[PDB]
Design a protein around this motif. Structure first.
Motif, short mmCIF file in Angstrom:
data_model
loop_
_atom_site.label_atom_id
_atom_site.label_comp_id
_atom_site.label_asym_id
_atom_site.label_seq_id
_atom_site.Cartn_x
_atom_site.Cartn_y
_atom_site.Cartn_z
N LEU A 26 0.81 -1.21 0.00
CA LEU A 26 0.00 0.00 0.00
C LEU A 26 0.85 1.26 0.00
CD1 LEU A 26 -2.65 -1.18 2.60
CD2 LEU A 26 -2.93 -1.07 0.13
N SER A 27 2.12 1.16 0.39
CA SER A 27 3.04 2.28 0.30
C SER A 27 3.66 2.42 -1.08
CB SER A 27 4.15 2.13 1.34
OG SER A 27 4.84 0.90 1.18
N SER A 28 3.41 1.47 -1.98
CA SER A 28 3.98 1.51 -3.32
C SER A 28 3.21 2.52 -4.17
CB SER A 28 3.93 0.13 -3.96
OG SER A 28 4.70 -0.80 -3.21
N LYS A 29 3.91 3.57 -4.61
CA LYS A 29 3.32 4.62 -5.43
C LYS A 29 3.30 4.14 -6.88
CE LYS A 29 4.99 8.70 -4.54
NZ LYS A 29 6.01 9.77 -4.32
N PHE A 30 2.29 3.34 -7.20
CA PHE A 30 2.17 2.77 -8.54
C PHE A 30 1.82 3.89 -9.51
CE2 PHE A 30 1.01 -0.90 -5.81
CZ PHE A 30 2.07 -1.72 -6.15
N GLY A 31 2.84 4.41 -10.19
CA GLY A 31 2.64 5.48 -11.16
C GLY A 31 1.89 6.67 -10.60
N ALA A 32 1.92 6.84 -9.28
CA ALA A 32 1.19 7.90 -8.61
C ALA A 32 2.15 8.81 -7.85
CB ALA A 32 0.14 7.33 -7.65
N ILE A 33 1.68 10.03 -7.57
CA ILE A 33 2.48 11.00 -6.82
C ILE A 33 2.36 10.80 -5.32
CG2 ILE A 33 2.20 12.68 -8.66
CD1 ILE A 33 0.52 13.46 -5.44
N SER A 34 1.59 9.82 -4.87
CA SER A 34 1.41 9.55 -3.45
C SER A 34 0.64 8.25 -3.31
CB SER A 34 0.67 10.69 -2.75
OG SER A 34 0.50 10.41 -1.37
N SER A 35 0.93 7.53 -2.22
CA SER A 35 0.31 6.24 -1.97
C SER A 35 -0.92 6.34 -1.07
CB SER A 35 1.32 5.29 -1.33
OG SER A 35 1.75 5.76 -0.07
N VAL A 36 -1.23 7.52 -0.55
CA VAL A 36 -2.40 7.74 0.29
C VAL A 36 -3.47 8.40 -0.57
CG1 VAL A 36 -3.30 8.84 2.36
CG2 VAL A 36 -0.97 7.94 2.33
N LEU A 37 -4.64 7.77 -0.65
CA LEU A 37 -5.72 8.31 -1.47
C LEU A 37 -6.17 9.67 -0.96
CD1 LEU A 37 -7.81 5.07 -1.98
CD2 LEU A 37 -6.09 6.03 -3.50
N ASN A 38 -6.33 9.80 0.36
CA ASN A 38 -6.81 11.05 0.93
C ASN A 38 -5.90 12.22 0.56
OD1 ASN A 38 -8.74 9.40 2.15
ND2 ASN A 38 -7.54 9.21 4.03
N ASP A 39 -4.61 11.95 0.36
CA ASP A 39 -3.69 13.01 -0.03
C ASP A 39 -3.90 13.42 -1.49
OD1 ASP A 39 -2.88 12.34 2.47
OD2 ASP A 39 -0.80 11.87 1.94
N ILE A 40 -4.29 12.48 -2.34
CA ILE A 40 -4.52 12.80 -3.75
C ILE A 40 -5.76 13.67 -3.90
CG2 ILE A 40 -4.81 11.84 -6.06
CD1 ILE A 40 -3.48 9.29 -5.07
N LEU A 41 -6.89 13.20 -3.38
CA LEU A 41 -8.13 13.97 -3.47
C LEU A 41 -8.00 15.33 -2.81
CD1 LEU A 41 -10.64 11.09 -2.64
CD2 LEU A 41 -10.12 12.05 -4.89
N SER A 42 -7.09 15.47 -1.85
CA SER A 42 -6.88 16.75 -1.19
C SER A 42 -5.92 17.66 -1.95
CB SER A 42 -6.34 16.52 0.22
OG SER A 42 -7.19 15.67 0.96
N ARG A 43 -5.09 17.10 -2.83
CA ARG A 43 -4.10 17.86 -3.57
C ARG A 43 -4.46 18.08 -5.03
NH1 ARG A 43 1.78 15.32 -2.41
NH2 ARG A 43 2.20 16.74 -4.16
N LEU A 44 -5.28 17.22 -5.63
CA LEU A 44 -5.61 17.30 -7.04
C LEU A 44 -7.12 17.32 -7.22
CD1 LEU A 44 -3.01 14.75 -8.45
CD2 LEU A 44 -2.92 17.23 -8.69
N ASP A 45 -7.54 17.74 -8.41
CA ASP A 45 -8.95 17.77 -8.75
C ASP A 45 -9.40 16.42 -9.28
OD1 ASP A 45 -7.20 18.26 -10.92
OD2 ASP A 45 -8.88 18.96 -12.15
N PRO A 46 -10.70 16.16 -9.31
CA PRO A 46 -11.19 14.84 -9.73
C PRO A 46 -10.70 14.47 -11.12
CG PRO A 46 -12.97 16.13 -8.77
CD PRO A 46 -11.80 17.05 -8.91
N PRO A 47 -10.75 15.39 -12.09
CA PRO A 47 -10.23 15.06 -13.42
C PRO A 47 -8.80 14.54 -13.39
CG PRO A 47 -11.44 17.10 -13.50
CD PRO A 47 -11.32 16.75 -12.06
N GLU A 48 -7.89 15.26 -12.74
CA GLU A 48 -6.51 14.83 -12.64
C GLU A 48 -6.28 13.82 -11.53
OE1 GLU A 48 -4.48 15.38 -14.81
OE2 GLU A 48 -2.53 14.79 -13.99
N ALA A 49 -7.18 13.74 -10.55
CA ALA A 49 -7.02 12.76 -9.48
C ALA A 49 -7.32 11.36 -9.98
CB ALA A 49 -7.93 13.12 -8.31
N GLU A 50 -8.37 11.20 -10.79
CA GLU A 50 -8.68 9.89 -11.35
C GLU A 50 -7.52 9.35 -12.17
OE1 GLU A 50 -12.30 10.24 -13.53
OE2 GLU A 50 -13.53 10.64 -11.76
#
Lengths: 50, 50, 50
Positions: A26-50
């Motif tokens: 779950l700590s593996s950032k699979f082609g992502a800028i972060s491994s925590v979902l809550n951090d993505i939705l908090s840092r990016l918009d839905p279009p770019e978050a998806e």
């Protein structure tokens, strides 16, 4: 002899090593800028978050 | 709202801390044809800390 | 199936604000597109007319 039941102890060890490693995945950032979902939705918009 | 910025080789870093920045107050200034954020979105700033 | 052409005027440097999943005073407090949007957006100069 403490290593008499190793055949059985290997089972519960692999079953633990199978899940424990699965938790670290779950700590593996699979082609992502972060491994925590809550951090993505908090840092990016839905279009770019998806 | 400054009068004259610096050159590209002698750019002036302006450290900012101990404040609350409402990034919405930047749009009311000169037009922004490019407001690209490469790590986050231009909207999730007023919801995150730094 | 069903095509609707929504229109509204913006005086220039605000067109990039109309996008699915965007916030602002012109998005949450004026006009909002859905996150499952299926269509196109347009923006252009109308000098002499307005």
């Amino acid at each position: 002899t403490p290593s008499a039941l190793g055949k059985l102890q290997d089972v519960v060890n692999h079953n633990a090593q199978a899940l424990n490693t699965l938790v670290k995945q779950l700590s593996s950032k699979f082609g992502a800028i972060s491994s925590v979902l809550n951090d993505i939705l908090s840092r990016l918009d839905p279009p770019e978050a998806e | 709202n400054a009068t004259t910025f610096a050159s590209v080789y002698a750019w002036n870093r302006k450290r900012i801390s101990n404040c609350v920045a409402d990034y919405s107050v930047i749009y009311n200034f000169a037009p922004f044809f490019a407001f690209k954020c490469y790590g986050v979105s231009p909207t999730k700033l007023n919801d995150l800390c730094f | 199936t069903n095509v609707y052409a929504d229109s509204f005027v913006i005086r220039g440097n605000e067109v990039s604000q109309i996008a699915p999943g965007q916030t602002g005073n012109i998005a949450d407090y004026n006009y909002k597109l859905p996150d499952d949007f299926t269509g196109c957006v347009i923006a252009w100069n109308s000098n002499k007319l307005d």
